[PDB]
């Protein structure tokens, strides 16, 4: 069933400035007229986010960019799509991307936001495809080549129904959809924001906060992911399913979150209006320290510079003598409790791993020392 | 299921009665961390995790936060800040067959201690030493799984025990599992003590004009004081003001 898409165009990855986007509400607690300092996984200000296109340039040897690679998930993803016809049909998440391990699929096929958790046997080039019928100008599902099989489904959720148009539009970009995906503590948290824009390049200067959308209690292993796009088949692309396809102009941006401390301003009317990234530059560090968005003239103490350790060195004596533990453990004769036998252990190398891992001892406890660290301690003397 | 493949089930969007289990007296061990069982009927939790497995009786206490052991390290680890309950009852009469029952296995060898609430299903050969395994056991290559010698005539210490661990996770999110309790008509403009979906307090409730966007549940002040709450069964926003007080 899966079409092995070929004839890709080679293009180096592009980057663009993330500006001050990627700020989301960290919790459901309402706040107002406050500046809250929260440490969470955020998108750093003024970073590079990777660019991906969806276009087929008309003309001889025109550029045919269908950017659908497998990207790592790392520790959260900021996914910002600029659109006017809603080409993207959702996302897939997984590590092996086969039936061997569990995987996640979010599909928005203009009916519902259907989330499935299955061991999908993903195709080599998973996608969705709509065949265009020119006579009645009707778009309908014709190909689902995201997976070759579906099994042992562990979770499925459906959002509110709707009917979104997939007709191609001309002119400037009008829709900007920002999403944040996190996979922490057994929960998959999806935050979103929609913005009407009037521009053709870059991201808007305005600051917007991404309100939460769904928190799925799934709890699955995730390291990589991949987006899904809806191609069009019609008379403009003659041929079979392998070559007769096209994709409307659209773009998306991928950024990676990381643990940062942010100062968020909940305004008087209940909405997040500004944020400060503490570790962006010394001025923002001062702003975070003072818990204010403006600073007057003066000198402020903020942090403490320190040079970090580089490598570890261990200096131990040249004496590689094994301690006589078998003299006591591998012993058939044992004295009475009132005449308890005492042996001294010194000037030898002791390996406590074998004693702990022998598993022949019903009771084994340690007072004042953690057992698992005995292998990394040096002692003056031992009494058995 | 086996202890290394403990079965995990999600409990939410339902009413739970923990008094029937405590008053059942059919469980050998009923021990809770972070919650008193007699008050569990008055609490609301965001989610409940039920981890069921079968272990040996002598290891009934082995599953506990901060404890050490092969089962804890490689089969089922509890977090240091574990909140919930542990339930255990003998299953010799129900899960042990004549000649011994070996359907239950436990992992003995692993590269590292399991993270709490981690499911391990791999049965790869553990390489104890420097000798490569390459799918071949022997010296420095041993099978990590061991059967449970659940002989019915064996001692009760080694008799099989069914163990269910309930993890009540609660966040600043709308609660799903709630005790029986009862919903009562709210009264405003009067100093009353309230229990809103688990969170208890005392004050006067007033109609509020603060926008609670559809995802907030309760707003708080500079301190950890719930300044506003969202009432279930009405989706109305109530400001909580401390009852009038002063010096004399």
């Amino acid at each position, epitope marked *: 069933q899966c079409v092995n898409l070929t004839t890709r165009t080679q293009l180096p990855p592009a980057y663009t400035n993330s500006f001050t986007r990627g700020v989301y509400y960290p919790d459901k607690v309402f706040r107002s007229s406050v500046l809250h300092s929260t440490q969470d996984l955020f998108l750093p200000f003024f970073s590079n986010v990777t660019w991906f296109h969806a276009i087929h340039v008309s003309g001889t040897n025109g550029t045919k960019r269908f950017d659908n690679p497998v990207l790592p998930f790392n520790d959260g993803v900021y996914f910002a799509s600029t659109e006017k016809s809603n080409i993207i049909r959702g996302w897939i998440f997984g590590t092996t991307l086969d039936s061997k391990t569990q995987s996640l699929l979010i599909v928005n096929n203009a009916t519902n936001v259907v989330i499935k958790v299955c061991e999908f046997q993903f195709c080599n080039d998973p996608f969705l495809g709509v065949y265009y019928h020119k006579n009645n100008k009707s778009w309908m599902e014709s190909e689902f080549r995201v997976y070759s099989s579906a099994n042992n489904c562990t979770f499925e959720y459906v959002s509110q129904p709707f009917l979104m148009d997939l007709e191609g539009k001309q002119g400037n970009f009008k829709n900007l959809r920002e999403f944040v995906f996190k996979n922490i503590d057994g929960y998959f948290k999806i935050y979103s924001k929609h913005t009407p824009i009037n521009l053709v390049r870059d991201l808007p200067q305005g600051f917007s906060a991404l309100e939460p959308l769904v928190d799925l209690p799934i709890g699955i292993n995730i390291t990589r992911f991949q987006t899904l796009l809806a191609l069009h088949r019609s008379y403009l692309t003659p041929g079979d399913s392998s070559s007769g396809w096209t994709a409307g102009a659209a773009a998306y941006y991928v950024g990676y979150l990381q643990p940062r401390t942010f100062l968020l301003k909940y305004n008087e009317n209940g909405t997040i209006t500004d944020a400060v990234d503490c570790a962006l530059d010394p001025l923002s560090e001062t702003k975070c320290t003072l818990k204010s968005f403006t600073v007057e003239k003066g000198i402020y103490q903020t942090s403490n510079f320190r040079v970090q350790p580089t490598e570890s060195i261990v200096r131990f004596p040249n004496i590689t003598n094994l301690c006589p533990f078998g003299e006591v453990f591998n012993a058939t004769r044992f004295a009475s409790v009132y005449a308890w036998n005492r042996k001294r252990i010194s000037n030898c190398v002791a390996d406590y791993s074998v004693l702990y891992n022998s598993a022949s001892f019903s009771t084994f406890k340690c007072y004042g020392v953690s057992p698992t660290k005995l292998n990394d301690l040096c002692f003056t003397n031992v009494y058995a | 299921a086996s202890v290394y493949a403990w079965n995990r089930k999600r409990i939410s969007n339902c009413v739970a009665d923990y008094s029937v289990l405590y008053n059942s007296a059919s469980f050998s061990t009923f021990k809770c961390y972070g919650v008193s069982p007699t008050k569990l009927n008055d609490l609301c939790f965001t989610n409940v995790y039920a981890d069921s497995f079968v272990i040996r009786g002598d290891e009934v206490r082995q599953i506990a936060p901060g404890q050490t052991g092969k089962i804890a390290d490689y089969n089922y680890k509890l977090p240091d800040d574990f909140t919930g309950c542990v339930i255990a009852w003998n299953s010799n009469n129900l899960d042990s067959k004549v000649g011994g029952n070996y359907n239950y296995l436990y992992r003995l060898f692993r590269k590292s201690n399991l993270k709490p609430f981690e499911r391990d299903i791999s049965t790869e050969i553990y390489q104890a030493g420097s000798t490569p395994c*390459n799918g071949v*056991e022997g010296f420095n290559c041993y099978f990590p799984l061991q059967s449970y*010698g659940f002989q019915p005539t064996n001692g009760v210490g080694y008799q099989p025990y069914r163990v269910v661990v309930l993890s009540f996770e609660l966040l600043h999110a709308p609660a799903t599992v709630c005790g029986p309790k009862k919903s009562t008509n709210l009264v405003k403009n009067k100093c009353v003590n309230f229990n809103f979906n688990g969170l208890t307090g005392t004050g006067v409730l007033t109609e509020s004009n603060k926008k609670f966007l559809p995802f907030q549940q309760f707003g708080r002040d500079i301190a950890d004081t719930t300044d506003a709450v969202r009432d279930p069964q009405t989706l109305e926003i109530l400001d909580i003001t401390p009852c009038s007080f002063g010096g004399v």
Partner: nanobody
Amino acid sequence: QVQLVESGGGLVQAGGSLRLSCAASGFPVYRDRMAWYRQAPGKEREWVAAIYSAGQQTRYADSVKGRFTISRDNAKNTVYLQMNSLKPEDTAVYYCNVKDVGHHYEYYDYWGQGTQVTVSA
């Protein structure tokens, strides 16, 4: 309590096939792992084959994988080892081995009497 009985084998001419039987008494065969060991005079102990009821069904040595077959019978509760395309080098004593755990967390390996296999050129 736990007893393993080995049957079959003996002296066989070249080109034949053999079937050894390890019968377990005192405990059901369905457990973690049943191992089969082969050793010649003047040789040290080394793992040869094993069958498991969980995870990977069977494991074998690198030089023996995919050649000599094993199976189990729960209804009759016995492990059968079928060996084909015999060679004179197969003359050795074979054991079937189990691992048992008691109240004191001990891990004891219990062997069988074994069978002698000799192949004549």
